[PDB]
Amino acid sequence: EDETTALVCDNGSGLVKAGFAGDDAPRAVFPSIVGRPRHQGVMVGMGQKDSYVGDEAQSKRGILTLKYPIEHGIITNWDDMEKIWHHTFYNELRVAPEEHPTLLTEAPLNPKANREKMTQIMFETFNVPAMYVAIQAVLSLYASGRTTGIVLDSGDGVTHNVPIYEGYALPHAIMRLDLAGRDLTDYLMKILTERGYSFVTTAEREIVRDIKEKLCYVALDFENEMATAASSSSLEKSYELPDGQVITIGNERFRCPETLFQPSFIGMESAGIHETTYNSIMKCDIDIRKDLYANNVMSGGTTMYPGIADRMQKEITALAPSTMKIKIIAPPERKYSVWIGGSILASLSTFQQMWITKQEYDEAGPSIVHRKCF
Template sequence: MGFSKPVVVIDNGSFNIKSGFACDNHPVSIFRNTVGRPKYLNGSYGKTPYEVYIGDAAVERSDELDLNYPVCRGKIVHWDNMERVWHHVFYRELKAAPEDRAVLLSCAPTTTMKDKVKCCEIFFETLNSPGLCVKPQSVLSLFGSGYTTGMSVDMGHDITEISPVYEGGSIEYAKMETNMSGHHLSEYIKESLLRRELNVDWNIDQVVQELKNKYVYVTKNSAVTRQQYMKTYKLPSGEEIDVSEEVFMAGELYFQPELVLHNKVNCLSLPDAILTSSLKCDSDLQPELFDAIVVHGGMRIPGIYKRLSRDLKLLLNRPVNIIQSTEAYAVAWMGGAVFAGSRESQRVWVSQKQFEEQGERIVRNRF
């Protein structure tokens, strides 16, 4: 199935949504996947006109808006708002008419067939797109790294998900979650700062976000000299505080959650989750999976690749290949762009006409 204009690629993330054209090598637009409505509506849509804010514009007005996040743990939970975000992507971000563009849409590996059909209904019946292809983010992340077999390690805002992929197909029964994500790191840092009863005449959420994005790190073997360990942070007020423990222990949450939280938690360390996921697969397949472990998602922590490689080698008693990327946050999108332009993708598109004639049946066949 050929299209006259470049395909639009949309990577639906819980925190950020990334979009662009398949002919490009990077997303055109990246913004917060959120919708804001005035608080005076009290959750109702209202009978009088009102302004709806989307993305970063909504976050900037969080004091006066009720924010809704359409995607939670990879699953679309609010379809009306998700439709608004997709409309915003076409008309405000990409400046492209949806009726002229086929769409490749990424989804979570656990997305149900019912949700895929709902995506088709919105893109074909509301946005009037000529074609749609829905692919799991785990598969696209492998494509974006130049592989078709391996393990996808998606380190997201509200979920860390490990998905084995074989020859471009996700092995769903072997999927694992660690129950530890970027959101948990933020909560740990925030609780630790509040516990110290510091002067909180500053925006603590802003401070936590900056510490998580710029200060958190992971050491190769969880050992560090005192000089390297000492970290200070300058508050907006000008006061300097010691954040050594927060930024060191936050990174260790991915590797030693019970040690950091001082109790038994319903979490797996990242290496244990990868090992468990691989053991669910056929033993003949496991060596191929370890040859391409693609770590991607919004969490970019210095040192995490070396630590993960070391811990997995100790667990498996064999070398592993951790695929690194300077643009790990966009790997799934780039995989979508690669797949949309490949000859193999022609077999899995659903056209508007096919959906009108066959409905759910064609979706089940193709997706």
């Protein structure tokens, strides 16, 4: 065949998004979890199966202890990551990686060891002709079809911010902020406890993740919505657990995403996500700032909450000069924007010479990641 296709995988924490390069959507999207039978089984003709990977672990949740292998964009456990990639290629996509070049995404300001060990596994585990590791935020920018913007990337791993102008990139102005979907989940199960609902274990920690994926929203003013929580009517929502227990969540619902704009609630000094965007834009040159204000791109899974775009717009407009208009461009489909940006990149004809070849790795070693790529 011509061009050989190519393979693209996004592994921020929480979800593997994977598929062929040259398509508009990934074939396989599943949770990045390795769930191990904690309870010793007593039957004959079970499994045994040392561990379960992917949405198999979601189905068989109650037995398992679940371990996310990626925390804060950092792989904690390498064998668990290899198992997840083994699951992507053989269980879903049914590809031999020898037949495809593979793009990986990776997060900004990330330890060198993750990029270098990630390449070491791609060559010396799944034999592969070529690969690339690319920055998450630039891929979302490509997916949005814009040449310029400040990309606010927040996954389940960590939050990142990369300003770009006309292509280029500003290394000093790149900001990484330790907040995530996962930290909002840990805050959320903590704020359910005051209501009497106690979720203590990894299995129902993913149940509050599912709650937060739909019920939670961001206030267009926090204090105003917290004041109208005195007359509870629309702010309460009934939620059904898989147990058949019913949960009723009021003001507790919208103050969980409020943590992004008030990290004093989590107990971290690190500024809210709108001030981090100001911190990135202020580090940029005076000239370009006009379009960075007007071309803010949201990406990732934890920018999905209803009303985030409006809240960021009101806060950035309030802080900034009202001399210029602050447009925020946050697409629906923004969850998959990194994977789509990886699809478009590996489909680019020129990019087919910028691959890290297997040959170039075999001569010059794993350290060449940083030398060739950003």
